[PDB]
Design a protein around this ligand. Sequence first.
Ligand SMILES: CCCCCCCCCCCCCCCCCC(=O)OC[C@H](COP(=O)([O-])OCC(O)COP(=O)([O-])OC[C@@H](COC(=O)CCCCCCCCCCCCCCCCC)OC(=O)CCCCCCCCCCCCCCCCC)OC(=O)CCCCCCCCCCCCCCCCC
Ligand SMILES: CCCCCCCCCCCCCCCCCC(=O)OC[C@H](COP(=O)([O-])OCC(O)COP(=O)([O-])OC[C@@H](COC(=O)CCCCCCCCCCCCCCCCC)OC(=O)CCCCCCCCCCCCCCCCC)OC(=O)CCCCCCCCCCCCCCCCC
Ligand SMILES: C[C@@H]1CC[C@@]2(OC1)O[C@H]1C[C@H]3[C@@H]4CC=C5C[C@@H](OCCC(CO[C@H]6O[C@H](CO)[C@@H](O[C@H]7O[C@H](CO)[C@@H](O)[C@H](O)[C@H]7O)[C@H](O)[C@H]6O)CO[C@H]6O[C@H](CO)[C@@H](O[C@H]7O[C@H](CO)[C@@H](O)[C@H](O)[C@H]7O)[C@H](O)[C@H]6O)CC[C@]5(C)[C@H]4CC[C@]3(C)[C@H]1[C@@H]2C
Ligand SMILES: CCCCCCCCCCCCCCCCCC(=O)O[C@@H](COC(=O)CCCCCCCCCCCCCCC)COP(=O)(O)OCC[N+](C)(C)C
Ligand SMILES: CCCCCCCCCCCCCCCCCC(=O)O[C@@H](COC(=O)CCCCCCCCCCCCCCC)COP(=O)(O)OC[C@H](O)CO
Ligand SMILES: CCCCCCCCCCCCCCCCCCCC(=O)O[C@H](COC(=O)CCCCCCCCCCCCCC)COP(=O)(O)OCCN
Ligand SMILES: COC1=C(OC)C(=O)C(C/C=C(\C)CC/C=C(\C)CC/C=C(/C)CC/C=C(\C)CCC=C(C)C)=C(C)C1=O
Lengths: 55, 64, 488, 100, 324, 94, 101, 174
Amino acid sequence: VKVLTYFGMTLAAFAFWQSMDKVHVWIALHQDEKQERMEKEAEVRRVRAELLRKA
Amino acid sequence: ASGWGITGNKGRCYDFWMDFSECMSHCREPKDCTLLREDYLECLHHSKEFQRRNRIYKEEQRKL
Amino acid sequence: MFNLFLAVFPEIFIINATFILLIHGVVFSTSKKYDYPPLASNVGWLGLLSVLITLLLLAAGAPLLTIAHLFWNNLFRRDNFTYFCQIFLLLSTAGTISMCFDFFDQERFDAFEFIVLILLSTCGMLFMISAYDLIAMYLAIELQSLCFYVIAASKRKSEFSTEAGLKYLILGAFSSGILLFGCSMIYGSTGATHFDQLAKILTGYEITGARSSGIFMGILFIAVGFLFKITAVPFHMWAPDIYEGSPTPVTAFLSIAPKISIFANILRVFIYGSYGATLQQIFFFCSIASMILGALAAMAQTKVKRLLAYSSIGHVGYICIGFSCGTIEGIQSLLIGIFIYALMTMDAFAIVLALRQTRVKYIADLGALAKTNPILAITFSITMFSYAGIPPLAGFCSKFYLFFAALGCGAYFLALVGVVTSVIGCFYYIRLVKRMFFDTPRTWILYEPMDRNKSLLLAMTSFFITLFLLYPSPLFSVTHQMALSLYL
Amino acid sequence: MDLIKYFTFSMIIFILGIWGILLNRRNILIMLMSIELMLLAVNLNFLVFSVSLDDMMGQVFALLVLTVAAAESAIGLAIFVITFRVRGTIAVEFINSIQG
Amino acid sequence: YIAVPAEILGIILPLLLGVAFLVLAERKVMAFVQRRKGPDVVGSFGLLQPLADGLKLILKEPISPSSANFFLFRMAPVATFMLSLVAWAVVPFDYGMVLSDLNIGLLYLFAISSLGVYGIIIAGRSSNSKYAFLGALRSAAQMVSYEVSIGLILITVLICVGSCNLSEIVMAQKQIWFGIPLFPVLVMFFISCLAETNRAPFDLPEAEAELVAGYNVEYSSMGFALFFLGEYANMILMSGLCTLFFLGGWLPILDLPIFKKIPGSIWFSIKVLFFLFLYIWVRAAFPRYRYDQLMGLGWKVFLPLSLAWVVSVSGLLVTFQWLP
Amino acid sequence: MMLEFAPIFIYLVISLLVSLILLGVPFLFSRFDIRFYLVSILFLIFDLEVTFFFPWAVSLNKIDLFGFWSMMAFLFILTIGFLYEWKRGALDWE
Amino acid sequence: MNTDITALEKAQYPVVDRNPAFTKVVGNFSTLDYLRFSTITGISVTVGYLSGIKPGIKGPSMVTGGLIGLMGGFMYAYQNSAGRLMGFFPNDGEVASYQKR
Amino acid sequence: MILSVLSSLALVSGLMVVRAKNPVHSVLFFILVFCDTSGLLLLLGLDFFAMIFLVVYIGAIAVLFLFVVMMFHIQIAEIHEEVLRYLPVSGIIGLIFWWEMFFILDNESIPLLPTQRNTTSLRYTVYAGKVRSWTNLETLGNLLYTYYFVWFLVSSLILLVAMIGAIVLTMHRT
Ligand SMILES: CCCCCCCCCCCCCCCCCC(=O)OC[C@H](COP(=O)([O-])OCC(O)COP(=O)([O-])OC[C@@H](COC(=O)CCCCCCCCCCCCCCCCC)OC(=O)CCCCCCCCCCCCCCCCC)OC(=O)CCCCCCCCCCCCCCCCC
Ligand SMILES: CCCCCCCCCCCCCCCCCC(=O)OC[C@H](COP(=O)([O-])OCC(O)COP(=O)([O-])OC[C@@H](COC(=O)CCCCCCCCCCCCCCCCC)OC(=O)CCCCCCCCCCCCCCCCC)OC(=O)CCCCCCCCCCCCCCCCC
Ligand SMILES: C[C@@H]1CC[C@@]2(OC1)O[C@H]1C[C@H]3[C@@H]4CC=C5C[C@@H](OCCC(CO[C@H]6O[C@H](CO)[C@@H](O[C@H]7O[C@H](CO)[C@@H](O)[C@H](O)[C@H]7O)[C@H](O)[C@H]6O)CO[C@H]6O[C@H](CO)[C@@H](O[C@H]7O[C@H](CO)[C@@H](O)[C@H](O)[C@H]7O)[C@H](O)[C@H]6O)CC[C@]5(C)[C@H]4CC[C@]3(C)[C@H]1[C@@H]2C
Ligand SMILES: CCCCCCCCCCCCCCCCCC(=O)O[C@@H](COC(=O)CCCCCCCCCCCCCCC)COP(=O)(O)OCC[N+](C)(C)C
Ligand SMILES: CCCCCCCCCCCCCCCCCC(=O)O[C@@H](COC(=O)CCCCCCCCCCCCCCC)COP(=O)(O)OC[C@H](O)CO
Ligand SMILES: CCCCCCCCCCCCCCCCCCCC(=O)O[C@H](COC(=O)CCCCCCCCCCCCCC)COP(=O)(O)OCCN
Ligand SMILES: COC1=C(OC)C(=O)C(C/C=C(\C)CC/C=C(\C)CC/C=C(/C)CC/C=C(\C)CCC=C(C)C)=C(C)C1=O
């Protein structure tokens, strides 16, 4: 490739990695909500299992 | 788990590993060693520590 | 200090003998005085001797192999299971070598390095069986694989042999990279590579909601590498091309020993470890796919080698059904299937090697064999019927267990697939018998009689195949012993 | 964020190897090069984990994996050489005679 | 860090001057052996000759032949020149006189040496000339062959020292210079250095009269000058490495106050000058090997001897417990 | 500490700049020989030998006799390979 | 180097010497050990001779086979003698010699 | 940021490995990838591995690849093909691998979000481990030859296989 082409590809890749950083921050910020959803679903599943075991 | 540290001393998480292994070596149910196991894994990845600190940062960003 | 090394006496001996043979071969193959003699047969006989002495050392020192187990613990683990697996591996290597001398002298394959590479790969498989850590397992697998890559390309002026080697190296390296990635993910997630540590960490949790995706994908990638190694569908297509393109003694060796070694590895990794139902489902689906594809593709084949390759793929499907069901009887049946398939494959390749002296290639080349060599046509027919699983031949055990597990694990689609694929297999196995006994071709091929080594090996394997079910107790007891020794 | 950044670096190398397999159907030399790329990515994975976990096992295995990579490349290039010598060409249409 | 570039320039610029005058010194010594005068017209005693030659080279039009490897053709001399320059970052001239006090400095030098082959290979391939390509292949093979012996000799020194730090390697010779007990190892190292720098009697690229075209035959103007400068800087570096590993670097000959008066940098310089003189002297004294003969020497003589010296030194030091 | 590597990077940048200046100022006014593959293979093997020698050489004071003999066994295997290459003519360029 | 001879499966016979020295094990060689040694070596020499005839190197082939057989037979005899002294193999002779000296 | 720069260089150089029309160019870009990898290793404090990656990957393996590829003199017609028709299959396979495999550590290794507070003061220093620090080299050498010597020797066997195979497959003695 042209030298300038390689440099421009490198700039685009740098932008991609900064975007990936933003994605990682987003994923980290949503740990608590994911835990809450997991807990609510676990409670629902446990209640269903206990209720069906009653019979 | 090996105990060989990268700077020539006992590995950071090796005492937790050994407590967990010694627990499991005589407890016939692994659920009795759950706490020690999650302590070992917390030492490897610091997941709960970082999650709690991120909660603190979140509340700071919410109250500002 | 010296007595600690009693745990590795067998391996030390075979490695040292291999070095001695390498030096002997290179010194006298280059000798002008002796007019550069071919040394493939001389080194082959000396290496058969070395394998038998290794077997003696290992079998007669059963307790001593467990000496200094704490000192050796972070390197390997020797027990009853590894004991019997290694003995079987050495026996298979000895038989395969014994089948090679007519090939050496009549083709004039003079390369003694062939024998050295076989011996080094045997060393690698020995270390594979006793591996008790992901690192050791990978290293031993790689040693074995590199030896196979080289010997698959041994006919270096042949288009077929060079093609086989190229396909093998590329696909083998790819699968090895996938397996190594899985190993790295497991280490990163658990901080451990020793099998004991992995067992302790993974037991009691499997997928308890908060499942380590790192652990789950490490297991998956390792399983993909293992399935490539056992030629399970869809990681199988290397096997038929490599089996056909390699020199026939190479094909015979690849058909048996690596399966024993890798199944020992699979047992000790998965069975002894813990992610669980996911992985048994992996092997379940791959077993069904392997049975179906092997049956159909074998039905398509017109050449003997390709037919045997696809037959082996189908049979590894049958065997993996036992691993899937996850019971002591499942493991025992897997071991019984491996042993019986190995003996049958040795019989079949002894016949194939005998017929390669007249360049057998097509199934139709067997025409009128019941006339030109009646006892050979009968012997080959017994092998085919055993492959088909017709009772009371030894091959019936694998069919019986396949259906026993289908009604034991509770799987009726599996039973239906087994019925259909068994009937397809019987058809393409009895097609060979029809070619040797029923056909009246215009042109016959007259085959040169086999050497003493292959006749004796064929005679013993043919008595075993016909008469095993009269006295099957030792195999049953030893396989139950091994299945139990995995956990106790 | 260090550990996620070090891991995604090695991960892009691994995905690039996979893509090189996918995009090079007429070029098996590049296929070999893509396999080396995957092996390099795995080696990097062991080294990063060794530091993160404060454990030496990742480092021992990394050295041994380098040995395996070297032997693999040597044997693979020998097989490439002999294939080329037999055919006079490296084109994929001359290594497709085994089939079915 | 703001003053780091000043230190780097204080290394690089005097080094380039030293190379320019090493060329002149080679010409002078060669002439004096040959009963003639070298350059003595351009400047007094010929001392302005290097500046004139460099000026001529920069004022020469570049050619850049119509090849399909336009970028690679010009980048190869840049690569070899930069590699010749960067090895000096870890070279200590006296106690504390070093740019980078690398703990892994020995292996770093080995890595730089291993990287040196690419400039020659790429120059040969990119030049679109079968003769240049063949010559480059032969030169590259020779360099990689002698790199093995260089590495094993490095290991021998490392066993004696117990550290890859070049300054520590020097200070471990306070009791005795390593060149005294390991004198055959030093001779082996010097010969391997000759072969590794493509110098006589191993100078294949100089054998145009022998129907062996060099890898840089298609180069003109400053690409050719870059190749030449990198080669001579590497000669100076090999002399410096011989001084560091076996002649005790900046240390005086005898631990006496009379010798300790003169600074360590002067000791180091004098030893380096001795080795450069030996480079020139050897070029003046002997004919050259054929390629096949020197390859045979590399693999059949120097490798076995280097490995044997590794085994003997390690075994002796382990036996009597004299390890560092 | 990795602090000492920073001057090396700045040195590389400066050396590159000097290279560009020197090179850019004048712009103002089908015969495969297997023996090269074989020498490459031999260099690869002994390159890894040196690689494995480095930690051993710095660790001799701690590993004592066991480490010495383990490295000796390593070298014995590799030297058997070298003898094989020597006998087969891989080291002859005539 | 820390060492530990302790085996996974305990010895089923009296332990005359837990970790016998090399020379003690060799001096413990019985007549049966020497018979095993000599048989293995002789078979190996015979195989070397017979397999060496066709290439024309029967002498050197005998030497190579004999080296392999010597090493294997010595390892086998050592295995048996050490296992007897350690109590892993039936060791009536070792126990009798131990209860007297 | 620095890891962003090195990862961008590695990404572009790797794409050049897998997409350059000339295989000699592919080998040269491969060499750039190993240089960037060495930079990462220096960031991790593993200077021995950083140097060994140069010595072995670039100094020996890449040299072997370059010698072989250069003497092959491959014509582009033999290995050319248009890759525009692969964009979808690479899109699905890449994305699935991307979505699964770039984020596999996120649930186990949750990142610490950098806050507007100086956490550097909470770094606890233990001087006991700093009295006699070990290099990466000596930490590795403490283990290779004694506690894990069997794996070391098996690697030697692997290299011996490489030597034998190289001779047997390619040697044509004059
Ligand atoms: C604080 C930092 C400050 C930094 C300041 C410096 C910043 C520089 C910015 C420059 C960007 C703007 C450029 C503006 C335009 C300039 C005008 C112009 O282009 O005319 C130039 C003109 C060619 O321009 P062109 O018109 O574009 O033609 C291009 C092709 O002809 C087209 O033909 P083609 O299509 O057929 O392509 C074939 C291919 C040729 O085939 C190839 O394979 C290309 C070569 C690539 C691999 C070669 C190296 C590996 C080989 C081994 C070498 C030895 C290894 C060991 C020694 C080195 C290791 C340290 O050509 C290419 O692909 C060229 C692509 C270049 C990629 C490689 C360079 C990037 C290296 C990474 C740099 C890292 C820092 C920069 C980034 C910083 C973060 C953003 O001529 C020259 O370039 C002069 C030649 C001298 C070049 C010397 C460069 C160094 C060489 C030696 C070192 C080798 C290793 C590289 C460094 C390694 C670091 C560890
Ligand atoms: C304000 C300051 C102003 C002053 C400073 C200004 C400085 C100048 C600007 C910098 C340079 C830009 C211009 C480049 C040179 C153009 C001039 C020219 O003559 O080019 C001729 C060039 C002809 O190619 P050649 O060099 O002569 O080589 C011919 C043969 O191919 C040679 O054969 P070969 O064997 O060597 O190579 C084989 C093959 C090589 O095959 C390839 O290289 C593959 C080509 C496709 C590349 C795909 C993307 C690769 C980059 C990585 C990006 C992340 C990927 C993540 C994927 C993993 C995720 C799962 O060749 C090709 O296919 C050539 C295709 C080149 C197309 C490159 C297109 C790059 C993608 C751009 C996407 C833009 C999206 C922006 C946002 C990105 C998302 C964050 O044609 C072009 O004009 C294309 C180049 C122009 C676009 C590329 C540069 C993009 C830079 C965008 C600006 C940065 C935005 C982000 C800023 C972030 C700030 C925070
Ligand atoms: C022979 C041939 C030739 C070719 C070749 O070899 C082969 O030649 C070889 C030559 C090689 C180069 C050699 C050298 C380098 C430099 C290196 O670059 C250093 C970067 C490291 C060091 O940087 C700082 O390190 C210290 C700070 O850390 C500074 O100390 C201060 O701070 C102390 C504490 O208060 C005080 O006590 C002190 O008094 C006070 O001075 C110190 O001055 C400074 O140097 C790492 O730093 C980063 O890392 C941080 C962590 O990730 C990042 O943090 C960020 O993320 C965090 C969350 O994660 C957030 O919390 C943060 O807020 C947020 O900022 C951040 O990006 C950044 O700091 C990058 C690699 C490279 C280029 C090599 C490339 C490859 C070669 C070309 C080889 C090539 C192949
Ligand atoms: C019931 C089982 C389930 C169903 C499967 C049946 C499988 C067979 C299919 C049956 C259909 C008919 C089969 C016909 C075969 C009978 C003919 C036959 O095999 O005769 C052989 C005989 O084949 C054998 O050699 C069989 C030997 C097997 C030995 C088994 C007996 C073990 C104990 C016997 C002890 C020795 C003999 C004692 C008395 C002297 C002769 O072979 P040729 O190739 O004709 O010539 C041989 C060369 N020469 C005569 C010169 C030596
Ligand atoms: C080019 C040179 C070739 C050299 C070839 C000759 C040497 C090859 C190596 C042969 C093995 C050792 C032979 C030397 C005998 C003397 C051994 C000795 O002196 O005993 C020492 C112990 O020596 C050993 O035990 C090391 C044996 C080396 C391992 C050789 C491998 C043998 C088989 C291994 C099986 C693993 C499978 C092999 C995989 C391929 C005593 O040390 P220590 O117990 O007092 O303390 C330990 C140490 O000082 C502190 O760390
Ligand atoms: C279980 C079912 C029932 C089985 C019944 C078993 C009964 C026991 C077997 C009885 C054997 C009867 C025959 C005994 C006399 C034959 C003696 C052979 C004489 C001999 O020296 O043969 C040599 C060849 O070696 C050879 O030919 C021998 C090697 C042949 C292979 C034997 C196995 C070796 C490897 C072990 C494989 C194990 C596989 C298990 C998976 C030379 O012969 P020559 O002088 O005619 O000249 C050949 C031209 N070169
Ligand atoms: C006769 O018509 C035709 C087809 O139709 C049979 C075709 O396909 C194609 C071409 C397209 C193909 C062959 C794509 C199919 C490829 C696949 C699925 C890749 C996997 C490879 C193999 C050998 C399949 C093995 C995998 C199986 C059996 C299942 C996977 C595993 C488990 C469930 C555990 C053409 C031209 C065609 O003309």
